[PDB]
Amino acid sequence: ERPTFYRQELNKTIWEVPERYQNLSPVGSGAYGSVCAAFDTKTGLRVAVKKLSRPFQSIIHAKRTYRELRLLKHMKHENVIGLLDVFTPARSLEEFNDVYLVTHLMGADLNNIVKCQKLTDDHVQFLIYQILRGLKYIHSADIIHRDLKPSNLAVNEDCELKILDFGLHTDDEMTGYVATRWYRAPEIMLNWMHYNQTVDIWSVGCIMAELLTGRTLFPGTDHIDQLKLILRLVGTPGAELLKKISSESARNYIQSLTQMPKMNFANVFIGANPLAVDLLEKMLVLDSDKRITAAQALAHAYFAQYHDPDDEPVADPYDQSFESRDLLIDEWKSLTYDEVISFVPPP
Numbered sequence: 001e002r003p004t005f006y007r008q009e010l011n012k013t014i015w016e017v018p019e020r021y022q023n024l025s026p027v028g029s030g031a032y033g034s035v036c037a038a039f040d041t042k043t044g045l046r047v048a049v050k051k052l053s054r055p056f057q058s059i060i061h062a063k064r065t066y067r068e069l070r071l072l073k074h075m076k077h078e079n080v081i082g083l084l085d086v087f088t089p090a091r092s093l094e095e096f097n098d099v100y101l102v103t104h105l106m107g108a109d110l111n112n113i114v115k116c117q118k119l120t121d122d123h124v125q126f127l128i129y130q131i132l133r134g135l136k137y138i139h140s141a142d143i144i145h146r147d148l149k150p151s152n153l154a155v156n157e158d159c160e161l162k163i164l165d166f167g168l169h170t171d172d173e174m175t176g177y178v179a180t181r182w183y184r185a186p187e188i189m190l191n192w193m194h195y196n197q198t199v200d201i202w203s204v205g206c207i208m209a210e211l212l213t214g215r216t217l218f219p220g221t222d223h224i225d226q227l228k229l230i231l232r233l234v235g236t237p238g239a240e241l242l243k244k245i246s247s248e249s250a251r252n253y254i255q256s257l258t259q260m261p262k263m264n265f266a267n268v269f270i271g272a273n274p275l276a277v278d279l280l281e282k283m284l285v286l287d288s289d290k291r292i293t294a295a296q297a298l299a300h301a302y303f304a305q306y307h308d309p310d311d312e313p314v315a316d317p318y319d320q321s322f323e324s325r326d327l328l329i330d331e332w333k334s335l336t337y338d339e340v341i342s343f344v345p346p347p
């Protein structure tokens with residue numbers, strides 16, 4: 001039956017949540033809503049509670065809301081954020097208008113870790129191993145992160161990690177000297193072609209490089225500057241990659257550039273474990289068809305001390321046919337409502 005809900009104003013909005021959640025405290029906007037840390041008295045867990053703002057304002061928001069809930073209801077892996085609870089104060093479809101998502105709360109993100117701790121190579125191994133283990137699971141359900149960066153990698157005090165914000169920025173956001181663009185595969189930064197899950201491996205390459213050196217790998221001041229930094233390191237594209245760039249416009253620009261050889265990674269990453277250098281070479285490949293995959297990378301010798309092939313699970317089939325569907329707001333809202341009401345807590 002239905003819990004009792006109580007009301008409070010947080011972030012100049014009214015938050016209405018079940019009594020089990022106490023000591024709500026704002027933690028800083030999340031994807032499509034604001035988030036509060038809270039104490040879940042029922043489980044004894046520190047949780048994060050996201051209130052979607054205007055979930056059913058438009059078709060875009062309504063589909064968006066359904067998308068996020070579906071994604072969260074499906075993911076059940078130690079290295080991927082999952083759904084602890086989802087609720088609405090509404091007693092019926094008619095009054096259903098607010099959606100709250102509850103997940104684990106981690107004490108830091110990877111951006112905090114990289115900024116204020118010294119990471120040994122063993123830390124680099126473990127952290128990257130977990131990101132690759134989570135991505136294998138995500139990629140197996142045909143989900144692409146597309147925006148993997150240190151700020152959406154949550155980490156507990158034991159250095160155990162979860163991936164957030166997969167499967168869901170404007171132009172201004174990607175503009176200038178900004179982390180929102182530093183980890184993006186070039187094919188997506190410059191819209192070269194229909195991209196796919198390989199975009200996430202480039203992002204991992206960029207994060208791993210940064211854990212090893214403490215410094216952003218390609219901190220471009222804009223898209224062009226960033227492309228120049230990238231090509232300086234990995235070489236300009238060859239004939240075969242070029243043909244695959246289906247944007248005639250992008251192909252044309254990139255061919256205007258002076259050809260440059262790929263650099264020696266052992267010279268760029270002095271002191272680094274040679275195995276780490278090898279994996280960076282396999283991840284940081286301009287041609288997405290030729291980058292190592294998450295499943296392949298887990299078997300790389302850099303991860304010998306963590307790799308366990310019987311303990312790197314794939315996901316249950318994820319039906320995302322809804323993605324190609326056009327529906328009205330009320331249709332997306334009712335679909336969402338069914339998913340709220342049919343939620344079953346993890347055990």
Ligand SMILES: Cc1ccc(C(=O)NC2CC2)cc1-c1ccc(C(=O)NCC2CC2)cn1
Nearest residue numbers: 048050103105106107108109154164165166
């Ligand atoms: C509450 C919530 C709802 C949805 C998604 C999400 O990933 N949705 C996309 C996947 C569909 C993520 C969160 C979440 C989880 C943990 C943290 C956290 O630990 N914050 C504290 C920060 C890390 C220091 C912050 N936010």
